[PDB]
Amino acid sequence: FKKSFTCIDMHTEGEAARIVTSGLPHIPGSNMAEKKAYLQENMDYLRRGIMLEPRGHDDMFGAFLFDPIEEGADLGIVFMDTGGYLNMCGHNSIAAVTAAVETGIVSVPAKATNVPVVLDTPAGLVRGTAHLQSGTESEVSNASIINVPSFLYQQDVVVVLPKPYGEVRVDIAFGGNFFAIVPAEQLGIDISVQNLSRLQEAGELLRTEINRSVKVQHPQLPHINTVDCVEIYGPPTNPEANYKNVVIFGNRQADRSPCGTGTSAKMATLYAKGQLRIGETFVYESILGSLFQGRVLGEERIPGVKVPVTKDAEEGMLVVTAEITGKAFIMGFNTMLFDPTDPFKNGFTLKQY
Amino acid sequence: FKKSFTCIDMHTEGEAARIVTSGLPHIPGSNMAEKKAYLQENMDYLRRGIMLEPRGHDDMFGAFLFDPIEEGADLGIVFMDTGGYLNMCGHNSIAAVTAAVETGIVSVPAKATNVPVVLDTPAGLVRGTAHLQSGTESEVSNASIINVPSFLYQQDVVVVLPKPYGEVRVDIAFGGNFFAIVPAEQLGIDISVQNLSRLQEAGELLRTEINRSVKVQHPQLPHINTVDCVEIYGPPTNPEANYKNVVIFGNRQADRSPCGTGTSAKMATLYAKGQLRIGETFVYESILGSLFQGRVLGEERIPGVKVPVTKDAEEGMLVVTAEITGKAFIMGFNTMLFDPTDPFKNGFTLKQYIWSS
Ligand SMILES: O=C([O-])c1ccc[nH]1
């Protein structure tokens, strides 16, 4: 138990969510964003040992739990992946809400049907609900999150990528992370496992180039000023779904889930274009066939605050409240071990350059 | 309904070895090759759930433990990976020996500096030794395994791969698994991290073509009749090593370790060619810079039993016994769970199958 961490290993519809429940020292920071920055700046080897081979792998994802800081929250959470720390994550939020109830972190009131679980994240407060299985104490049927405010940021941004991709037109939207949203048709490849390595490559190229050429800034959270995810979308395979997508992020890893923050950013974009009404269910499919359900539950304009998309004819920037629903499973309870003489105590990747 | 398995998650110089220690269903079989066959044929969903995403991944490896059957063994063991089931595995044997002593599966005698751990495998009896740290009862510094007999099987086999590989010449050798051994240079790829996808692809196509064109058969073990592994070798980077290799196997996964059966195979080949002598240390490097040490312990002719390399005038085939030494670490104690309603209770891969047109 020398250097050890305890993990609730979960997945949300195929996407990993390794929830680290114990093992950290005190992490300085007066909010969750500072605690994230502390880990990144001072203890990044932890993320690497927990996320990467041999203990993890190139498409691993997870989070560290903390005591809540913000008033009203049940749990503090910092997300991590193979390349860095996202400000929010829908699939891991869904998993954390589920684990909080299944493992007893949060109590179930007698005869409750739904149990609130509020997450204090680097992007803000995420209000979750675990929907209980009919005849049970704490068995979770599925879980919903009300995301932090999402918004379209900038439209029809032309990004110049090298051959074979060339010029590509994207939207930038915020769904807890900044996304570039791009039709797969523009990249000349369809969403499939056959194309997954090219989709990864195309997503890395796109992210790199837009962060070079376009400076983004969340108007309410100064620390959010990069595009961290690329959402590549196209026509659905499952007739229950409106669209399919794959999100590329981290060290060009791919989300196996439909991506909760990416679903929020998509819904905000569609809502801004008049294509979704309040309460309307949007169903996003993943590369694996997984589904998430979203609804926009509210909109607001914020006078005197604008983003590049905001027209002069509008009073202020449009933001929306998105709810995302999906299902997570506990797939293990792990005690992770780090022997000081282990040459890969800090993990490794064989992913090309 | 709900299933759980306990795992000791290990790695051997970067290569996973997920050792399942309890929670398996009860499996028939009168030997470990039959238990492997029973799993393969009737309960392959266990391997898939345990090896593949989301609980594993495309380069995961492991083993199930059983009661020993063969006289003299401490543990029965069946190996598994992302494609199927290898008859032997050096790195996972080194991991099992290590874990056996470190977790008290086997006891350490009074003031012992070395502890035997014998494994009953689908390839035969593998005699291992945990080498202990100085002032400890059960801390392991490294572990050595004496493999089942290895041998060169067939020499200079030419097979034609698709473009861009074309015709390639290889040796077929048994080191607990049958290997095709090829120089990276013949494939026109350097062994490097940058080239790992290409190495995987060439390894898959070579394994497939070899099995199509050359029908192998272990002369003492009827159930071993395919080439399951491809060993691609080249010049060392570490000046302590003789060579560097990557082994492609499973669903074209790659060994991050130097590969213990592939070292045995390589040593049996070099030995057959007069390039390595009994007791001489051979050091093999992996793509990660990991090292294993190997030594030929002995040779033997088996009268009236021949393989293709055996000469008309030679009265029986040559076999060698190799010992391999490496180090394993415990990386996790895991309780792995499978909800009947989980659509990924049996795992998934996003790796695409490939084949020659
Ligand atoms: O669900 C999400 O928001 C997510 C982000 C990256 C991977 N999944």
Ligand SMILES: O=C([O-])c1ccc[nH]1
């Ligand atoms: O060490 C070995 O023998 C091995 C075989 C496949 C992967 N590692």
